[PDB]
Write a protein that binds this ligand. Structure first.
Ligand SMILES: CNC(=O)[C@H](Cc1ccccc1)NC(=O)[C@@H](CC(=O)NO)CC(C)C
Ligand SMILES: [Ca+2]
Ligand SMILES: [Zn+2]
Ligand SMILES: [Zn+2]
Length: 158
């Protein structure tokens, strides 16, 4: 049963981490959504101005919700389940080291986990699953969604 009632969702990258170029940030975020798109009927589009279903941002410590960030390591990011207002948004701890390599922490794998939340998935007990609550570098190169996450997206949207 769908958390999101629409299949064509929009996203907006609110600010960027200065640790990567803007293009590098945009590609990691896009690659992250396409992972979920190939296993479900959902399609993602970026917008420049206005209201997006999914807002993405980099914040430091207290940022206006109930979950303040905690500096380097510890919690890396958080996301809200489908809803109105903050629902669907993904927040990244600006105090982390963000990369696009195997070095901690790879933005693409962190954003791919957050987006599962954004779409309605919960955490997974399978350590090989992207929805697992502990970060692990897997690869990036020919990374495709693990089996457990396909089962989880398919169970909600077909
Ligand atoms: C190096 N840090 C971690 O692996 C911590 C470990 C942890 C787990 C529970 C409580 C505190 C810390 N995990 C997270 O930051 C996760 C928080 C979360 O689930 N967002 O949606 C996100 C990763 C899976 C990408
Ligand atoms: Ca942190
Ligand atoms: Zn937040
Ligand atoms: Zn999570």
């Amino acid at each position: 049963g769908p958390k999101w009632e629409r299949t064509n969702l929009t996203y907006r990258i609110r600010n960027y981490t200065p640790q990567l170029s803007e293009a590098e940030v945009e590609r990691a975020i896009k690659d992250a959504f396409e992972l979920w798109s190939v296993a479900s009927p959902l399609i993602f589009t970026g917008i420049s101005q206005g209201e997006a279903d999914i807002n993405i941002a980099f914040y430091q410590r207290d940022h206006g919700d109930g979950s303040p960030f905690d500096g380097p390591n510890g919690i890396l990011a958080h996301a809200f389940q489908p809803g109105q207002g903050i629902g669907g948004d993904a927040h990244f701890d600006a105090e982390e080291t963000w990369t696009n390599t195997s070095a901690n922490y790879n933005l693409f794998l962190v954003a791919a986990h957050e987006f599962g939340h954004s779409l309605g998935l919960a955490h997974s007990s399978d350590p090989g699953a992207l929805m697992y609550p502990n970060y692990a570098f897997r690869e990036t190169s020919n990374y495709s969604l693990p089996q457990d996450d396909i089962d989880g997206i398919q169970a909600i949207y077909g």
